[PDB]
Design a protein around this ligand. Structure first.
Ligand SMILES: COc1ccc(-c2nc(CSc3nc(N)cc(N)n3)cs2)cc1OCCF
Ligand SMILES: COc1ccc(-c2nc(CSc3nc(N)cc(N)n3)cs2)cc1OCCF
Ligand SMILES: COc1ccc(-c2nc(CSc3nc(N)cc(N)n3)cs2)cc1OCCF
Ligand SMILES: COc1ccc(-c2nc(CSc3nc(N)cc(N)n3)cs2)cc1OCCF
Ligand SMILES: O=c1ccn([C@@H]2O[C@H](COP(=O)(O)OP(=O)(O)O)[C@@H](O)[C@H]2O)c(=O)[nH]1
Ligand SMILES: O=c1ccn([C@@H]2O[C@H](COP(=O)(O)OP(=O)(O)O)[C@@H](O)[C@H]2O)c(=O)[nH]1
Lengths: 232, 233
């Protein structure tokens, strides 16, 4: 009976900041951060493997995209099962917030690597098949009750990457942000994007504007999330 | 419980296709599962189109395509084997499903070989193994084997037999690739010296059949052994 909620949005939208705010507000509220965040960093063999392929992807995305995308999605699924069958036990009003989803894996990141030619046809169709299957064999219990879209302009995100001062992100272009921004807008706002996941097409969505700094002034955002939660 | 599942293992062109085509005629309670890869050799389906494409590139450039090929082949094998459980041998008295190869040849014969030939780098190989571990962990007793039949043939036999089958992309297959695959087959199924990461495999019954002798119009003795093997599982 744990409520599953995806937190979605562009690079440096403030997803991590937001989720770390939410888990501290209730004893019923828990967070699963995404694998890619964990990799970008006495450390596990997923880190080991995650470290290498993220680096490999930066040199040569047209060689490594499929391997990376395949591994990122398994790593997410495992983690999401780990918290769902353990953690939050056994809350009165349990809610698990997922940082991004297997849908963002596929329809944001994997799709954009295919469109920019870092995956060929065969890789993209093997990926979608593998995706459809990995999720239907193992990921049933990962269907989302709702989605929270943190909406920021592509410009705020690039500025937010600068504010976060990580050396390796510094060369991310605004057009790359625009592609991902547009892809988010057509999946989550316009709802033009048709997935192979029919139930998604009518999952409730809460769209929040995080252009303006919320780190010291988040209560109105938290109010909107609590209202959205009761409505499910 | 309650379909018995027996995998047929052996080197390339040892004679697994020929022997399952023989076995499956002899009892309506016996079915077979052709291995997806052997199918990918030949409007076609999604998988078959991907398979043939990923196979040719694999041939053309194994160090690029080994990780991709091996995951698609194994995912597709699990798919074909799970369907068979479902669509097959619903009500029959003693159901037996004969898999042409298994999830364990995918990894410990082929992917492993490919790693050993530097066709997959360390991170690739480790990623493959991670995925293979977890994924078979999820099924448990369901695809898990009741028995292996090993069809053991020397590489010369296999080499000659590749000649007899006469496939274009196959005459390239060098004698020394065949010898290495033999090594791994002997170690896993004959001398039982392969460490592996699935507990029950140490226990699983294995019938070895010497198949160096042509057996096409002369296979009763081999079949008799199989019938005797089954009545112990
Ligand atoms: C089309 O051009 C790009 C598209 C995407 C990128 C991205 N870079 C990243 C940073 S990868 C990274 N590695 C780390 N080790 C740590 C970390 N925080 N981030 C994410 S998206 C960067 C791009 O331009 C950089 C080319 F050198
Ligand atoms: C030089 O060109 C690139 C360099 C790096 C990238 C990278 N993208 C990433 C992010 S891929 C990703 N997939 C996910 N499924 C999730 C997630 N958080 N990130 C890391 S490095 C992507 C690049 O090309 C993108 C082409 F628009
Ligand atoms: C180290 O050298 C090799 C080792 C193994 C091979 C192999 N070829 C194959 C068959 S390639 C094939 N492609 C197809 N499209 C169809 C089909 N039946 N077979 C299996 S293993 C091929 C090798 O070299 C290719 C030409 F020397
Ligand atoms: C040019 O070098 C190669 C060319 C082709 C191969 C091929 N192996 C295969 C089959 S590997 C296989 N993996 C499986 N998982 C299952 C299965 N039945 N067969 C097709 S093409 C393997 C080659 O190996 C190079 C040195 F290991
Ligand atoms: O309202 C905000 C939200 C985020 N940030 C900063 O912007 C960067 C991106 O935030 P985060 O890493 O949480 O974004 P994510 O990539 O997780 O969506 C970080 O330096 C944050 O501390 C900020 O200054 N104000
Ligand atoms: O007793 C036998 C078994 C097989 N073959 C031939 O050897 C080749 C390889 O056999 P098969 O396709 O069964 O090998 P697999 O790859 O399935 O092990 C084929 O052309 C068969 O006709 C044979 O001459 N006598």
């Amino acid at each position: 009976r744990i409520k599953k909620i995806s937190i979605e949005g562009n690079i440096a939208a403030g997803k991590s900041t937001f989720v770390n705010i939410l888990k501290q507000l209730s004893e019923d509220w828990e967070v699963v951060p995404e694998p890619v965040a964990r990799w970008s960093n006495e450390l596990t063999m997923e880190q080991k493997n995650g470290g290498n392929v993220l680096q490999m992807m930066y040199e040569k995305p047209e060689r490594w995209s499929f391997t990376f995308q395949t591994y990122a999605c398994l790593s997410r699924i495992r983690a999401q099962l780990a918290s769902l069958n353990g953690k939050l036990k056994d809350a009165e009003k349990p809610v698990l917030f997922f940082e991004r989803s297997v849908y963002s894996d596929r329809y944001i990141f994997a799709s954009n690597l295919y469109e920019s030619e870092s995956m060929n046809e065969t890789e993209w169709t093997i990926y979608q098949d593998w995706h459809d299957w990995m999720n239907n064999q193992f990921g049933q219990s990962l269907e989302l009750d709702g989605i929270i879209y943190l909406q920021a302009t592509p410009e705020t995100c690039l500025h937010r990457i600068y504010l976060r001062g990580r050396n390796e992100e510094q060369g991310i272009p605004l057009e790359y942000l625009e592609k991902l921004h547009y892809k988010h807008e057509s999946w989550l706002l316009h709802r033009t994007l048709k997935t192979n996941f029919d139930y998604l097409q009518e999952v409730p969505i809460l769209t929040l504007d995080v252009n303006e700094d919320f780190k010291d002034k988040y209560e109105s955002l938290v109010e909107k999330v609590k209202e959205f939660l009761s409505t499910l």
